[PDB]
């Protein structure tokens, strides 16, 4: 079942041709050294599998590789199984030697060791721990460092999967959460992340959402929240496990309690439990306070945490309409962390809800301010240009290691220097795999926020409203920081209009700046764009135009118009960007609507199947987001009716049902505990 699926995934990995042999491993080692000597390694590099081949005519060694996440490195067993499948299922020509070296690389960011498992043609393997700063150093592997490689791989797999901008094209994402016993496999992952909570500040953080890593804001906490979000039946288990950890390790109580609060956040059933734990966590902590003239570097570490817990409280109170109580908490939070964006953000929200717009604008003013990868991939740009950067010898070698592929079929699936082959076709539908996904290609990295850089240049040029593009390019992109501030401004114009917002700005001046002025003008242009009615006396507009207009309407909270525009962008061709926005709306609706259903389940299920198919084409077999959405659909439909609607889809077949029924079975297993 799951083993069948895993082996099929292992046999369907792409191939990147190394230009010069071993560049892949040398670049990795050099990247790691730069990360270490820059102070912030973060999660380090994604795992790679390297394959070393010998051409025999020519006496040339050459290499192939690909990026992968989701292999659990508990110890060497699972990577070795992966490598064993790769070698036993090889199909090579006579000119390629049977002596192949396979290497799996997993970086451990707890010890800054790159762990490498080498697999030879005599079926022997050896594991090596490389320190890149101490250069010549190779180490002996203890069970303690095996466990932090394990935690490294799991954290990195979750974070990478839930952030498409971090994904390289051709990334293989394995379903790390499946196993022989689903519940047991999920428990093991959760317990792993929980035990490493005292070290969560060493797991790196996203600097675009917070200035410094905090107990709340770090990748370990994020990854734990993201995984629990698809295992809601294990929340009670996790809370119990965390309570056990406090008993045995009370010196790190603040981490365990912060995880408890994080897990329970945004779960309506457990609001009383969250508030209660928040209470017993916050009003000691208030007391490491006062006794302290020494000012120590842990005091800033705890003021940050206390501030972040107050923000959780503030957000809770705002969402229940308790504006007076929220302001009392938010004022306290801003004092403990004047460096915190989130503290000023919530303060501004308190003032807006209390219709104190001047004070909100002051709070906004008094507020604080890519892994060189991807040479190897060339975009198809909707079939307008050729995407082939291989030499004849490089192609001969590639074909020689993929003997079962007929060579013109192989060449059609090469995008630059990577062969985007997917042999077992798990998740296949004809509509997606043999058409739209061949155009466009993988939608990932910083350009994946829209399709401007993926379609034909002509389609971009055929858009006459330049502002539609100018307000949707990739540098201009709002950013998470100013996207939040944009939201505050939009929340204000919603009440008093844009001209009213300007009047408050001078009110604030009466008791001036530039970057906020940029947002004001951007906001204005977006509002003008948002009231474009885009038809009859019957023109025609490309899908890209409908998409871009939809994105702007989302930005200005025109939900009905946005959903309508995004849907029509899919009528022409399937649009992964529009699709993802629609799925997101269904998963987490806007709060300001009158409990309206913008998208019925039949529409959503239609989109979800196409999206799952698209993600599978380029090796995303993890799909945490789509699992979340399937779970929500299961909740309100039941699993029987849901599966009926999936079977109704015109593009449905065995290949896509293998993926979907695997997902459904995993979800069904979780509803037992």
């Amino acid at each position: 079942g799951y083993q069948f699926l895993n082996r099929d995934i292992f046999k369907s990995c792409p191939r990147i041709m190394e230009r010069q042999f071993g560049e892949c491993l040398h670049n990795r080692t050099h990247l790691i050294k730069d990360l270490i000597s820059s102070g912030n390694v973060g999660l380090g590099p994604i795992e790679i599998v390297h394959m070393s081949y010998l051409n025999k005519h020519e006496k040339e060694e050459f290499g192939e590789y690909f990026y992968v996440t989701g292999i659990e490195v508990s110890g060497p067993a699972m990577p070795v199984e992966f490598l064993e499948v790769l070698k036993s299922s090889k199909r090579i020509s006579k000119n390629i030697s049977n002596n192949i070296i396979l290497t799996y690389c997993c970086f451990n960011f707890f010890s800054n060791l790159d762990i490498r498992i080498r697999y030879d043609a005599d079926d022997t393997f050896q594991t090596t721990a490389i320190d890149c700063n101490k250069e010549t150093t190779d180490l002996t592997m203890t069970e303690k460092m095996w466990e932090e490689t394990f935690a490294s791989s799991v954290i990195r797999a979750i974070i990478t999967n839930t952030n498409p901008e971090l994904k390289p094209p051709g990334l293989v994402e394995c379903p790390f959460y499946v196993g022989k016993d689903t519940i047991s496999s999920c428990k093991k992952i959760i317990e792993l992340l929980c035990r490493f909570l005292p070290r969560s500040l060493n797991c790196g953080w996203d600097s675009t959402k917070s200035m410094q890593a905090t107990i709340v804001n770090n990748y370990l906490m994020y990854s734990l929240k993201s995984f629990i979000a698809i295992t809601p039946s294990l929340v009670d288990f996790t809370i119990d496990y965390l309570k056990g950890l406090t008993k045995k390790d009370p010196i790190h109580d603040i981490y365990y309690k912060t995880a408890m609060i994080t897990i329970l956040d945004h779960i309506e059933t457990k609001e009383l439990d969250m508030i209660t734990i928040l209470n017993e966590t916050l009003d000691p902590l208030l007391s490491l306070l006062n006794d302290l003239p020494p000012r120590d570097a842990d005091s800033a570490r705890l003021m940050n945490c206390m501030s972040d817990l107050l923000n959780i409280q503030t957000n809770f109170l705002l969402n229940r309409g308790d504006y007076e109580l929220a302001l009392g908490v938010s004022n306290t939070s801003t004092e403990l962390a004047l460096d915190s964006f989130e503290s000023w953000y919530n303060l501004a929200r308190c003032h807006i809800k209390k219709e104190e717009y001047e004070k909100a604008l002051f709070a906004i003013n008094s507020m604080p301010r890519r892994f060189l990868t991807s040479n190897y991939y060339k975009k198809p740009l909707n079939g307008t240009r050729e995407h082939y950067d291989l030499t004849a010898m490089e192609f001969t070698n590639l074909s020689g290691t993929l003997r079962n592929w007929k060579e013109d079929e192989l060449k059609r699936q090469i995008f630059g220097r990577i062969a985007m082959i997917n042999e077992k076709k798990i998740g296949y539908t004809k509509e997606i795999w043999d058409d739209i996904a061949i155009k466009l290609g993988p939608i990932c990295g910083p350009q994946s926020v829209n399709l401007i850089n993926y379609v034909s240049p002509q389609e971009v040029k055929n858009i006459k409203n330049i502002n539609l593009i100018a307000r949707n390019t990739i540098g201009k992109q709002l950013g998470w920081f100013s996207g939040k501030i944009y939201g505050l401004l939009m929340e204000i114009v919603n009440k008093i209009g844009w001209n009213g917002l300007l009047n408050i700005r001078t009110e604030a001046f009466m008791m001036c700046e530039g970057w906020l002025d940029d947002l004001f003008l951007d906001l204005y242009q977006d509002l003008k764009l948002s009231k474009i009615s885009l038809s009859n006396k019957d023109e025609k507009h490309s899908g890209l135009e409908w998409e871009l207009l939809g994105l702007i309407m989302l930005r200005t909270w025109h939900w009905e118009d946005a959903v309508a525009c995004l849907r029509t962008s899919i009528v022409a061709r399937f649009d992964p960007v529009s699709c993802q926005q629609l799925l997101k709306i269904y998963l987490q609706p806007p709060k300001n609507i009158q409990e309206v259903t913008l998208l019925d389940t039949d529409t959503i299920i239609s989109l979800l199947i196409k999206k799952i198919s698209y993600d599978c084409r380029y090796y995303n077999y993890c799909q945490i987001f789509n699992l979340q959405l399937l779970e929500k659909l299961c909740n309100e439909l039941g699993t029987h009716i849901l599966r009926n609607k999936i079977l109704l889809q015109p593009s449905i077949g065995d290949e896509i049902m293998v993926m979907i029924d695997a997902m459904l079975a995993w979800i069904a297993d979780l509803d037992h505990t």
């Binding site: 079942g1 077992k424 065995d654 293998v658 029924d661 459904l664 079975a665």
Partner: peptide, 14 residues
């Protein structure tokens, strides 16, 4: 269901 999963895979082979 895991039975549905096995049925799909048994059919993938044809």
């Amino acid at each position: 269901y895991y039975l549905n999963l096995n049925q799909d895979e048994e059919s993938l082979l044809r």
